[PDB]
Write an enzyme that holds these catalytic residues in place. Structure first.
Site, PDB file in Angstrom:
ATOM      1  N   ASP A 159       0.894  -1.187   0.000  1.00 48.01           N
ATOM      2  CA  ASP A 159       0.000   0.000   0.000  1.00 48.01           C
ATOM      3  C   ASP A 159       0.924   1.226   0.000  1.00 48.01           C
ATOM      4  OD1 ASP A 159      -2.266   1.773   0.511  1.00 48.01           O
ATOM      5  OD2 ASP A 159      -2.172   1.323   2.675  1.00 48.01           O
TER       6      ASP A 159
ATOM      7  N   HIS B 217       6.872   4.441   6.768  1.00 48.75           N
ATOM      8  CA  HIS B 217       7.283   4.395   5.341  1.00 48.75           C
ATOM      9  C   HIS B 217       8.439   5.366   5.090  1.00 48.75           C
ATOM     10  CE1 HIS B 217       4.765   1.905   2.724  1.00 48.75           C
ATOM     11  NE2 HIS B 217       3.794   2.085   3.630  1.00 48.75           N
TER      12      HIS B 217
ATOM     13  N   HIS C 165       7.128  -1.674   4.587  1.00 52.82           N
ATOM     14  CA  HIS C 165       7.192  -3.103   4.854  1.00 52.82           C
ATOM     15  C   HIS C 165       8.388  -3.688   4.091  1.00 52.82           C
ATOM     16  CE1 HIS C 165       3.095  -3.318   6.626  1.00 52.82           C
ATOM     17  NE2 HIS C 165       2.650  -2.619   5.579  1.00 52.82           N
TER      18      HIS C 165
ATOM     19  N   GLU D  87       5.433  -8.714  -0.044  1.00 53.16           N
ATOM     20  CA  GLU D  87       3.956  -8.514   0.045  1.00 53.16           C
ATOM     21  C   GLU D  87       3.323  -8.836  -1.313  1.00 53.16           C
ATOM     22  OE1 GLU D  87       0.286  -5.491   1.287  1.00 53.16           O
ATOM     23  OE2 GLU D  87       2.346  -4.939   1.835  1.00 53.16           O
TER      24      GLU D  87
ATOM     25  N   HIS E 180      -0.356  -9.129  -1.791  1.00 53.24           N
ATOM     26  CA  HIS E 180      -1.774  -8.870  -1.428  1.00 53.24           C
ATOM     27  C   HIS E 180      -2.692  -9.108  -2.638  1.00 53.24           C
ATOM     28  CE1 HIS E 180      -4.161  -6.236   1.637  1.00 53.24           C
ATOM     29  NE2 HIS E 180      -4.933  -7.195   1.106  1.00 53.24           N
TER      30      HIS E 180
ATOM     31  N   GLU F 244       1.111  -9.287   4.609  1.00 50.68           N
ATOM     32  CA  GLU F 244      -0.051  -9.634   3.753  1.00 50.68           C
ATOM     33  C   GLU F 244       0.455 -10.371   2.508  1.00 50.68           C
ATOM     34  OE1 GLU F 244      -1.496  -5.589   3.329  1.00 50.68           O
ATOM     35  OE2 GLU F 244      -3.068  -5.930   4.832  1.00 50.68           O
TER      36      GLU F 244
ATOM     37  N   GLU G   6      -0.193  -3.621  13.628  1.00 48.65           N
ATOM     38  CA  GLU G   6      -0.956  -2.418  13.181  1.00 48.65           C
ATOM     39  C   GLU G   6      -2.242  -2.263  14.012  1.00 48.65           C
ATOM     40  OE1 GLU G   6      -1.685  -2.525   8.989  1.00 48.65           O
ATOM     41  OE2 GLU G   6       0.244  -3.469   8.502  1.00 48.65           O
TER      42      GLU G   6
ATOM     43  N   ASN H 145      -6.727   4.133  -9.558  1.00 43.72           N
ATOM     44  CA  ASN H 145      -6.089   4.702  -8.338  1.00 43.72           C
ATOM     45  C   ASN H 145      -7.034   4.550  -7.145  1.00 43.72           C
ATOM     46  OD1 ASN H 145      -7.619   7.269  -7.510  1.00 43.72           O
ATOM     47  ND2 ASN H 145      -7.231   7.674  -9.675  1.00 43.72           N
TER      48      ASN H 145
ATOM     49  N   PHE I 220      -6.176   6.895   0.259  1.00 44.12           N
ATOM     50  CA  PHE I 220      -6.025   5.755   1.203  1.00 44.12           C
ATOM     51  C   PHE I 220      -4.551   5.605   1.616  1.00 44.12           C
ATOM     52  CE2 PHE I 220      -5.852   1.212   2.369  1.00 44.12           C
ATOM     53  CZ  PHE I 220      -6.753   1.246   3.411  1.00 44.12           C
TER      54      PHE I 220
ATOM     55  N   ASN J  44      -2.358   8.242   5.704  1.00 39.24           N
ATOM     56  CA  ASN J  44      -2.698   7.473   6.938  1.00 39.24           C
ATOM     57  C   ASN J  44      -1.821   7.894   8.136  1.00 39.24           C
ATOM     58  OD1 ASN J  44      -3.050   4.359   5.014  1.00 39.24           O
ATOM     59  ND2 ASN J  44      -4.522   6.019   5.295  1.00 39.24           N
TER      60      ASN J  44
HETATM   61 MG   LIG Z   1      -3.906  11.427   9.806  1.00 39.91          MG
END
Ligand SMILES: [Mg+2]
Lengths: 1083, 121, 120, 120, 120
Positions: free
Chosen positions: A190, A334, A368, A393, A395, A440, A506, A566, A570, A573
């Protein structure tokens, strides 16, 4: 078959993996060191950008080839951030059609890099290696026209011996770089998809006979007092005949030096293994990061390694660090910067770590993939625990046992190579406590085999993979790890004997305005066994800096680079914005992670508990403050001796206290500077109420005038005129000395602008009827009642969903106005977002003051970080710019606030409290715009006065709700406040006196037959100008039989019936808690 | 000779003479008979075959006394079963060898309980 | 059924010696053989309630123990548990007693642990 | 209650020696320590009926034994008896099992006695 | 076994006022004595670490005591105000195969049993 489509082929022509030696960090000076024989290849490279590999000019790798007309690019960088191609953001789906191991041949961004370099003559009596730190996602290498080989993993190095194909003087290095490869199928994080040589490059030389690798481990005794050192040295001969001298020197944190090993060694490929004892060594931690240094010299080959004495183990399910229970107060991070992308600098890496420690965080999870070697060094030096995570990963590939790449034979050696190249590179860093297998990427044999390998190689660190533990217990991990578990799950875990500690890799998803019910997690972790903490998701919002049409900066997310498909915002975060600016939610983290606990025994006497593992509270400067109606009146420093674990008492002499409201704050701060923060930095604090206030009520003797016309009721008091509409039953205008104070009527308001959490749980659909009920309303009735000293204006209003809402304004002679609201919801309406009023004033009103929680925005489920005090701000700085505009600005538990245009003050007090927020734009504006830049200019300020607003939640952001105990369920609700418009700020403790009693009648059958049922009727009239909320209790023969909860609006009767059952023969006493009594006979 | 990294008794020297050709390992499997194949034992009880080859070392400690030394090794196993192994060496050159096995709530029946090791021919 | 190892706790030991002769299989090294035990409950309770009797069993010895913990009430066998304690490990048990009437009641085991319990 | 001898079986032994010196209290004479056991029942029964499991325990050793005989059904602990067998004495027990459904069932003890039972 | 928690239950007395001592007893006789002091205010709990020797098949028992550092109006220096004991290690029991014989002589009123130089 193409090499970039073949999963079994993981590289070619590359050297075996070894620990990091270059660059070294010197713990004593905190400067970076390099080898003498060292050529950087950072800087400008000739660069050519193609749409795919098959649109590259032929013979582009040959010396003879002419590149003079090529563009120049700077190394290191991601070429999306230099101009070339576009960045693409996808969550789970691949950006190409999923059919492993195949990648598109028409759309596959390619980048060729050329560069000439000068090798000195004296280098060739030595062995020469070319070191890439990181490339994404595949590359070929040519030297002087010849093909050397290729490499695939994006986040571990690649190293090539060149001594044979490289000549004195000028030599050519040619690198082709493909964006997508078989390797991409295991890099489905992600995050943004980027490409290019995005970490350093460099040449270096070593003697023919040299030290290839070093593994240093440490053990501690049962008392954690004495240590041992276990040293593996691996040597490598490349044509050396003469014997060379080996020396191994230990250097202490103090600075003292000791020779461990001094011996001659015949040139050969061998692994030498030593064991040493060390008395009372200085033990490494996150609190106390003491580093030792190993100096190794073989002939003219010199290398240094930094290690620390520290032991991680599990005893009876519990997680110990140097013999003490450890709590992981952690965040996911990240490697991302808004201007450079993945190509992150040391300066920014130092900014991040300092900010973390300053906010009581003790652990980072490299989500990750492995980071730049320099990150782990800086975690060693500053003192953070690390969870290191291999670059796996998948996913986008289904996790079904047949489908998943974890259970395919052809993907075996890929999985293995990615894990092995992380371990071998990082094994020596004391900061790294847990290896993580990936993220994942399903479960299968491919992870099982790679795990067992780690444990036989390194016994000193615990393994972690959520992918396996989500399906239940798993033999090949040491830690039970779940993502975003609900409370029940934690409590279930704790309920039975467990061999393995529980860690949330998480939790508390920080997307937009979020991180609700944090304290409620930690209240459970600290109480129940086998729970040891977790890591928040995540540290930084992945917003790219961009410019719009007008040229005003905004933070860009998915679908702001014509990139389709896209996943929008998301990727946003964080708990900080892209430029590391904190989001209010960070101040709640700091408060919940703090390591001192303070409990009120008595008003004067407080019990301090020291929750550090290896620090005495004597290291901190104690202070206490008292605040009278929000202002300091007393301050006093103190020190308190307390070892790790201990509880100590703190006595505080209190002054004589008047009718005001007193609040005690107790804080701890840094006695002197540290590498991560200055003297006076606060590390923990707690507040407590000492005395509630005494509230005044003043009989008003001054009069009030009333003038009716067709379309308006007008109420004059002192030098303020209030104007009501007969046709809209709303307070429309306030004139104060012939000066307009309102720009739009005062309207009931039930809505709030949906947050990222709200959108995730479909709030806008589920609670739509409350949005409509905020804009539309029928006036059913409207009347007024004058008295000598006051006039009441009542307005009854039905609402979409069929809910009733009563509004009562009482104006007093002294120019105060009481504003009450009852809300009676309809039997079939869903939960309410917000209860409160809304209105607009001119923009002139530009400065706000308030006595409440502050200084930053708080909400019902995130307000522990709010200190009660007086505060002052401009209206512009009473909100927070969220990358996607959202609900923002709320102040909680406010006694009073005032707006100021310089001369005139609009004052609002609670009865006894309110929640408020001010904006320089409409709700409608705030809901419409999706970027900070688009927030318009407006000649007015929106004011929100609110009983309460539902919690933010954020246990996840794709279905989770706020916890029950932060939701307005549909029952009757009342709410009032006082407003005054005057040149000064009046005392919030003084109010106009009003009657406060209800009229009550009780009635029943004075008799009944044994077996029958008694029906007791109660009429409750409310003649007074405020909403009442009463608990009607029925007693029989002195014992509490039943209770009802009522909410009577002004000028309204309410009727109740109770049913009594089981009365035996004889007389029986029926009475209430409203002075109503009656003897009842039973024939 | 014990390994800190594999928590297994690896080697026995008797007058400087090697007695083991492979470590002493817990062993739960047996080679399927014709009856076993008929009732699908190899599928049903697969997890015990894996648990005969692979194991994580969770913990490992020792305790000396005047006349003896104990070496303990705690090991989790495929199917999530725990297995404890305790070696006590005495002054007189005897070694006591104990094994507990705590199976996980959802594991099927066990073919065999016992140790396995190799010596020269 | 009566030839199948069903998944419950299991222990197992043996002696090994490497020597020029064959020693007597009847002779073994002496070791301690006792467990440490603590019992604990509510010294009292209300008629109808439930009594919770907790037992800690420490094994300091170098062998796996396999024990049958029996709870007696007023001399009569009320319940039994089967335990397997590995070396250097504590095991905790809870028994639930039900139906005690008013008056004093004797709670004891087969591990030399005793306690009078009152029922208000 | 927890310091009274209530009327149930009890055993008790000691060693005595008349000599010129005090011998080591840790050293004793070796003796056999096992019981002989037999188990027996109806190899079958009708759903609803009651299975009657008979156990003989012979003590040919020179000391009184105290044993907890546990019955298992399908690997779960069903019932337990406490016995005290004097030297040169056989004891007989009967257990009653109730609520076996149709199908085969595993009856075993903690004394190495097993038996498949059918339920028509 | 090596770690012990001391709790001070005096209202107005620091434990620093007392001389600490610990002793280890092998099969009843002592083998190791040490003195120590411990700082603990009323209410406080403090840990006490005791290094243990390597222990043979004997039965070991620790004893921890506090005494008066100097004389008081009511007692003399050394007087013991508090002590507690603990089992460190149980003993290993020996069993020895006896090869020697035993005679027996019956008559009308007596059984006679001879072994070494003792007749029963
Ligand atoms: Mg925030």
């Amino acid at each position: 078959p193409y090499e970039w489509e073949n999963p079994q082929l993981v590289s070619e022509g590359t050297e075996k993996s070894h620990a990091s030696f270059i660059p070294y960090l010197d713990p004593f000076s905190g400067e970076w060191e390099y080898p003498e024989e060292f050529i950087s290849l950072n800087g400008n490279w000739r660069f050519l950008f193609a749409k795919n590999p098959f649109e590259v000019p032929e013979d582009f790798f040959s010396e003879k080839f002419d590149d003079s007309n090529w563009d120049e690019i700077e190394v290191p960088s991601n070429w999306e951030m230099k101009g070339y191609g576009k960045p693409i953001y996808t969550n789970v789906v691949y950006p190409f059609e999923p059919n492993p191991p195949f990648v598109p041949k028409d759309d596959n961004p390619t980048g060729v890099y050329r560069r000439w370099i000068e090798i000195p003559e004296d280098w060739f009596k030595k062995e020469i290696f070319l070191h890439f730190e990181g490339v994404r996602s595949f590359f070929y290498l040519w030297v002087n026209g010849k093909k050397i080989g290729f490499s695939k993993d994006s986040c571990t190095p690649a190293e090539f011996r060149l001594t044979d194909v490289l000549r004195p003087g000028k030599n050519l290095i040619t690198v082709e770089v493909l964006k997508w490869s078989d390797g991409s199928y295991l890099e489905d994080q992600d995050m943004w998809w980027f490409a290019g040589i995005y970490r350093d490059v460099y040449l270096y030389a070593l003697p023919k006979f040299h030290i290839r690798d070093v593994f240093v481990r440490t053990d501690l005794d049962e008392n954690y007092r004495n240590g041992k050192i276990f040293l593996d040295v691996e040597m490598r001969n490349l044509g050396e005949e003469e014997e060379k001298d080996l020396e191994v020197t230990l250097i202490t944190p103090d600075g003292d030096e000791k020779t461990l090993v001094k011996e001659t060694v015949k040139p050969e490929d061998r692994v030498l293994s030593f064991a040493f004892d060390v008395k009372d060594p200085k033990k490494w931690s996150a609190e106390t990061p003491h580093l030792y240094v190993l100096k190794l010299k073989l002939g003219e080959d010199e290398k240094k390694v930094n290690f620390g004495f520290r032991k991680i183990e599990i005893k009876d399910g519990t997680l110990l660090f140097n013999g003490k229970p450890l709590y992981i107060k952690g965040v996911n991070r990240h490697e991302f910067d808004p201007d450079r992308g993945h190509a992150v600098t040391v300066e920014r890496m130092i900014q991040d770590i300092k900010l973390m420690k300053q906010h009581n965080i003790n652990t980072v999870r490299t989500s990750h993939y492995p980071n730049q070697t320099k990150w782990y060094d800086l975690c060693d030096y500053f003192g953070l625990y690390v969870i290191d995570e291999a670059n796996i990963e998948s996913h986008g590939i289904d996790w079904d046992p047949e489908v998943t790449l974890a259970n395919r034979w052809e993907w075996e050696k890929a999985h293995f190579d990615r894990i092995k190249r992380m371990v071998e590179r990082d094994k020596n860093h004391p900061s790294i406590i847990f290896w993580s297998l990936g993220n994942e990427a399903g479960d299968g044999v491919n992870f099982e085999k790679a795990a067992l390998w780690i444990k036989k190689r390194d016994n000193t660190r615990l393994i972690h993979y959520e992918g396996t533990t989500r399906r239940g217990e798993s033999y090949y991990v040491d830690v039970f790890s779940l993502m975003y578990p609900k409370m029940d799950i934690l409590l279930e875990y704790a309920s039975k004997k467990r061999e393995k500690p529980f860690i949330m890799c998480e939790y508390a998803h920080a997307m937009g305005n979020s991180v609700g019910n944090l304290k409620d997690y930690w209240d459970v972790i600290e109480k129940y066994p086998y729970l040891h903490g977790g890591c928040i998701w995540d540290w930084v919002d992945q917003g790219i800096r961009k410019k719009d049409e007008n040229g005003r900066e905004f933070w860009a997310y998915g679908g702001d680079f014509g990139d389709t498909p896209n996943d929008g915002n998301f990727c946003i975060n964080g708990v900080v914005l892209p430029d590391r600016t904190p989001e209010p939610e960070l101040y709640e983290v700091k408060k919940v992670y703090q390591n001192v606990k303070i409990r009120q025994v008595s008003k004067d006497t407080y019990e301090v508990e020291n929750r550090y593992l290896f620090t005495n509270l004597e290291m901190f400067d104690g202070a206490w403050k008292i605040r009278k109606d929000g202002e300091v009146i007393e301050e006093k420093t103190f020190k308190i001796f307390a070892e790790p674990g201990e509880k100590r008492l703190l006595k505080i002499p209190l002054p004589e206290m008047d009718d005001s409201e007193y609040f005690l704050e107790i804080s701890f701060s840094l006695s002197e500077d540290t590498p991560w923060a200055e003297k006076g930095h606060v590390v923990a604090w707690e507040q407590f109420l000492l005395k509630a206030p005494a509230f005044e009520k003043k009989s008003i003797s001054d009069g009030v005038s009333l003038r009716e016309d067709g379309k308006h009721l007008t109420v004059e008091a002192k030098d303020t005129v209030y104007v009501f509409s007969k046709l809209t039953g709303l307070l429309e205008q306030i004139l104060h000395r012939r000066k307009k104070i309102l720009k739009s009527p005062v309207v009931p308001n039930f809505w709030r602008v949906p947050t990222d959490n709200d959108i995730g749980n479909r709030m806008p659909q589920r609670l739509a009827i409350w949005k409509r009920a905020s804009k539309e309303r029928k006036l059913f009735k409207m009347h007024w009642k004058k008295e000598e000293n006051r006039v009441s204006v009542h307005s009854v209003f039905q609402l979409p969903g069929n809910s009733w809402v009563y509004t009562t304004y009482t104006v007093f002679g002294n120019g105060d106005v009481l504003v009450d609201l009852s809300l009676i919801p309809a039997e079939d309406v869903p939960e309410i977002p917000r209860i409160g009023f809304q209105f607009t004033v001119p923009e002139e009103f530009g400065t706000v003051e308030w006595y409440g929680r502050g200084p930053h925005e708080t909400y019902w489920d995130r307000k522990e970080s709010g200190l009660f005090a007086r505060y002052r701000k401009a209206v512009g700085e009473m909100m927070h710019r969220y990358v996607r505009p959202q609900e923002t600005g709320n102040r909680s538990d406010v006694r009073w606030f005032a707006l100021s245009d310089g001369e005139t003050k609009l004052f609002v007090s609670g009865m006894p409290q309110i929640d408020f927020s001010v904006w320089p734009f409409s709700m409608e504006d705030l809901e419409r715009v999706q970027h900070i830049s688009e927030l318009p200019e407006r000649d007015f300020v929106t004011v929100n006065v609110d009983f309460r607003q539902m919690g933010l939640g954020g246990d996840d952001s794709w279905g989770a709700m706020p916890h029950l105990e932060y939701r307005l369920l549909p029952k009757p609700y009342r709410f009032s406040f006082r407003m005054r418009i005057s040149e000064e700020i009046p005392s919030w403790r003084v109010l106009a006196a009003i009657p406060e009693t209800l009229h009550v009648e009780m009635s029943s059958e004075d008799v009944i037959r044994e077996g029958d049922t008694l029906r007791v009727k109660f009429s409750l009239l409310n003649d007074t100008p405020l909403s009442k909320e009463k608990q009607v209790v029925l007693f029989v023969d002195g014992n509490e039989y039943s209770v009802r909860r009522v909410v009577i609006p002004p000028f309204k009767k309410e009727e109740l019936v109770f049913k009594v059952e089981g009365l035996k023969k004889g007389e029986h006493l029926i009475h209430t808690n409203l002075n109503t009594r009656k003897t009842i006979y039973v024939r």
